[PDB]
Design a protein around this nucleic acid. Structure first.
Ligand code: MG
Ligand code: MG
Ligand code: MG
Ligand code: MG
Ligand code: MG
Ligand code: MG
Ligand code: MG
Ligand code: MG
Ligand code: MG
Ligand code: MG
Lengths: 101, 50, 106, 126, 48, 142, 186
RNA sequence: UAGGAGGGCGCGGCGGCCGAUGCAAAACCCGGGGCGCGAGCCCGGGCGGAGCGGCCGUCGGUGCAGAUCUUGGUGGUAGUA
RNA sequence: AAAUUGCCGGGAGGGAAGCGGAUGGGGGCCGGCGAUGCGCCCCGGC
């Protein structure tokens, strides 16, 4: 038989947020990026980084290679956090591993 | 976040300050908090309250 | 006399007599003594994480057990239990813990 | 290794609250469902019928969730999660998760040995 | 009239320059609002 | 803590990377915090190693015998993560290290809070170092 | 058995805490729980419970109405648990010290440019821990559009209640029941 | 009871965090031990042979004993008519 | 997996059985099922 209340494509997929409320939330998010306790608590390994906010010179701009990028992260205290990301990669449990995720 | 020096200096351009029409954005001013200093330690243990 | 004794005990005058604050007014001249502050150990071997609470050497002084009025020395007792159940014995005296000292005689 | 609890654990009921009539049907599960029937004599609480759970049966808040060991349990998956019980060893007992392998369990047991942490499935998978 | 200067972190191969810290942007001092974040994060995320 | 600690506690109280919470949101909930500068590993603002500028750490060192590491952060270096922490390696005797912990946790008014917890964590950390080396001797059930 | 209604238990409801999980308003509440607890300022008790209030129970106050209420009392601090909105219909505003949860941008500029102060409630507790020399003000609660529709029904005698109608014009809710020529006049 | 609300439990995805697993994952089985007033949950033993779980936010084709319910399988009737 | 069935071992039965509270008898299972340590001390070494 057919399902109860068959799903339709005219569900409300996309929801609108005020232009100003979007900007307010971005402002709050930016501020929190400058607080070491919150960047720690959200799971980033920031323990050899010199200063927050972490500003690096413009010479980084011109780099080219993933190997070049690796040195830059090492000269900061940033490569450890990139380590955790690469080491944590695994296959997604559940149905998503066959839904192109 | 790792900021480049090129980018960290544009932030004040992009978001401006507590002043009207300072942002690159139009019709926007940075939000002000409900509590100027959030230190309950300082307020509760100030001379005025004690 | 249970209540009569109780009334006597809580009398403000008589508790002063009982405790003996006189004759402690004697030693240390015209005053009642002071004290000091023990526990200056400065040598914890361990540090417990539970909020510690130390060993009790109780100051409470339980009253001695009463002897039944008809248990008077020389009286013959019957044992009601134990391996000598039914045996008739002689009552000698009450002991310090309250237990009765008896003899067969053997 | 010596538990802090200095108060006997009283249970007001040890039997479970089985579902009414789950003894009469097979496809009925024994998990508790409250009867909503209009004539249900279980719902109306006649004497001689199966009992319904109340808040009145609730166990003393002091000795709640303590195992007969007189420790409260916390399931660990690795040595790091074990080391969180270092300062709670007289209230909390560790227990290795059911899907922790034999190799990993030997490590947790070795490490729990030094920190003096009560472990309630120390012999499993060996 | 004062705001701290954020130290810029040099990198190997750079020419040593008489540079100084960038003053802290005003936005990096904005109120922290986690209720607003999760509200906006929910609604924005569903637009893809 | 570039913002106040009272504010930070508000943000990280209900969710953060160190809080391991088990057994639901009912009266069965058990929750611990595995951050290294929390002395009892308790998720509270008193013991929080996140929502305090002044925190104490008492850890057994890496592979090495009888070395206790004591760390205290610096109030004015909050925005310099690398050199926020002042750590000290002590391989002296217990009663002598009990003095060092008091000197840096209590007598300077750093965190008179954590006088008892720091010493108790030293007692537990130090004993774990003996047993690691000497091996298990006692069972401690008495 | 004891003869009581609902076991003698309270059936009314009041907000014992605010609804918003806004971190700064949560911090302000901790301050005023302490202040009511230790200082026993009756002013402090009012401020606390008004902090536990919904947006409709804390209506905005215009600067025109605030300027009227402050007139002659410019040695005191105006206190509003709510929002101060700017009013273009006013010209004279005295230098005045106002504490509120929010100021609109135009309002705050108008107050400051007069030589006043836009205080927060944390700043108020520094400068008045017991609410001394304060003017505690509310805004008009029954001024909302929704309030017009409240009360006796639109079609009963002596009621001037606004009806819920989708449009205005002659074809919408005018004929039978609104004039003598069509049936009756309400 | 009809009815209303609050706080929880459970199922499947998504964004994040924290983890288990060929030194044996899921599912299933048990006169195994426990926790919770309860929804449920944790562990033991076995079977199996490659995946899985907890927490925060968020979302839904999300919880069965009934409907002469739908489909499949199975009894007693009965070694009977 | 369940319904349902066979075999082996165990248990009970005078026109139903199952069920709720009690406990008694059998089983079956539980060693964090239940401790042997801490303080003074005398050496004899670390
Ligand atoms: Mg009826
Ligand atoms: Mg009329
Ligand atoms: Mg679906
Ligand atoms: Mg459905
Ligand atoms: Mg069914
Ligand atoms: Mg039904
Ligand atoms: Mg079967
Ligand atoms: Mg048989
Ligand atoms: Mg029976
Ligand atoms: Mg029995």
């Amino acid at each position: 038989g057919r399902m109860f209340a068959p799903t339709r494509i005219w569900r409300k997929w996309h929801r609108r947020v005020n232009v100003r409320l979007r900007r307010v939330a971005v402002a709050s998010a930016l501020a929190a990026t400058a607080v070491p306790a919150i960047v720690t608590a959200r799971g980033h390994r920031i323990e050899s980084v010199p200063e927050f906010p972490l500003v690096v010179s413009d010479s980084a701009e011109g780099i080219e290679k993933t190997a070049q990028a690796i040195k830059v992260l090492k000269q900061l205290g940033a490569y450890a956090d990139a380590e955790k990301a690469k080491d944590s990669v695994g296959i997604r449990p559940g149905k998503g591993k066959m839904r192109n995720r | 976040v790792i900021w480049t020096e090129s980018a960290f200096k544009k932030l004040d351009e992009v978001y401006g300050s507590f002043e009207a029409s300072s942002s690159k954005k139009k019709g926007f001013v940075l939000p002000r908090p409900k509590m100027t200093n959030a230190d309950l330690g300082r307020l509760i243990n100030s001379d005025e309250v004690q | 006399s249970k209540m009569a004794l109780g009334i006597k005990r809580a009398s403000r005058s008589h508790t002063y007599h009982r405790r003996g604050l006189w004759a402690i007014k004697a030693k240390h001249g015209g005053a009642l003594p002071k004290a000091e502050k023990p526990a200056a150990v400065a040598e914890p071997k361990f540090y417990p994480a539970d909020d510690v609470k130390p060993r009790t050497v109780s100051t409470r002084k339980p009253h001695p057990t009463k002897l039944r009025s008809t248990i008077t020395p020389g009286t013959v007792l019957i044992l009601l239990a134990g391996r000598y159940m039914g045996k008739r014995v002689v009552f000698l005296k009450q002991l310090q813990s309250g237990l009765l000292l008896i003899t067969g005689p053997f | 290794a010596v538990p802090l609890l200095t108060r006997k654990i009283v249970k007001k009921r040890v039997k479970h609250f089985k579902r009414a009539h789950s003894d009469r049907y097979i496809g009925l599960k024994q998990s508790w469902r409250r009867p909503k029937g209009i004539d249900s004599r279980v719902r109306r609480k006649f004497k001689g019928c199966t009992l319904m759970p109340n808040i009145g049966y609730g166990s003393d808040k002091k000795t709640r969730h303590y195992l007969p060991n007189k420790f409260k349990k916390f399931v660990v998956h690795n040595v790091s999660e074990l080391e969180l019980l270092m300062m709670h060893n007289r209230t909390y007992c560790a227990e290795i998760a059911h899907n922790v392998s034999t190799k990993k369990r030997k490590d947790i047991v070795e490490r729990a040995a030094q920190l003096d942490i009560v472990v309630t499935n120390k012999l499993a998978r060996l | 009239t004062a705001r701290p200067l954020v130290s810029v972190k040099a990198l190997d191969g750079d020419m040593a320059t008489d540079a100084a810290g960038v003053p802290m942007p005003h936005v990096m001092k904005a109120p922290i609002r986690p209720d607003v974040i999760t509200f906006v994060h929910r609604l924005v995320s569903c637009n893809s | 803590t570039t913002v106040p600690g009272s504010l930070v506690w508000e943000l990280v109280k209900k969710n953060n990377c160190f809080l391991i919470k088990q057994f639901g949101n009912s009266n069965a909930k058990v929750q611990f915090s595995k951050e290294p500068n929390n002395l009892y590993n308790v998720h509270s603002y008193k013991f929080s190693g996140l929502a305090n500028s002044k925190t104490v750490a008492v850890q057994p060192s890496a592979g090495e015998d009888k070395a206790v590491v004591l760390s205290t952060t610096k109030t004015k270096k909050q925005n310099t993560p690398a050199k926020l922490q002042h750590k000290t390696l002590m391989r002296k005797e217990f009663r002598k290290m009990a003095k060092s912990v008091k000197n840096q946790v209590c007598d300077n008014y750093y965190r008179p809070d954590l006088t008892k917890p720091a010493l108790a964590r030293l007692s537990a950390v130090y004993r774990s170092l003996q047993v690691s080396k000497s091996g298990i001797k006692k069972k401690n059930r008495q | 058995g004891i003869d009581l209604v609902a076991g003698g238990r309270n059936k009314r409801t009041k907000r014992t805490a605010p609804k918003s999980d806004d971190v700064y308003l949560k911090l302000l509440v901790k301050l005023y729980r302490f202040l009511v607890r230790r200082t026993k300022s009756q002013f402090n008790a009012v401020i606390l419970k008004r902090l536990f209030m919904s947006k409709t129970n804390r209506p905005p106050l215009s600067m025109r109405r605030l300027v009227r209420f402050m007139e002659g009392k410019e040695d005191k601090i105006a206190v509003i648990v709510g929002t101060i909105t700017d009013d273009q219909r006013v010209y004279e505003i005295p230098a005045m010290k106002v504490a509120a949860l929010r100021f609109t941008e135009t309002a705050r500029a108008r107050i400051v440019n007069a030589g006043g102060e836009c205080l927060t409630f944390d700043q108020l507790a520094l400068r008045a821990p017991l609410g001394q020399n304060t003017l505690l003000l509310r805004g008009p609660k029954n001024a909302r559009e929704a309030v017009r529709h409240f009360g006796k029904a639109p079609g009963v005698p002596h009621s001037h209640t606004k009806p819920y109608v989708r449009s205005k014009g002659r074809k919408f809710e005018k004929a039978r029941g609104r004039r003598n020529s069509r049936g009756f006049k309400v």
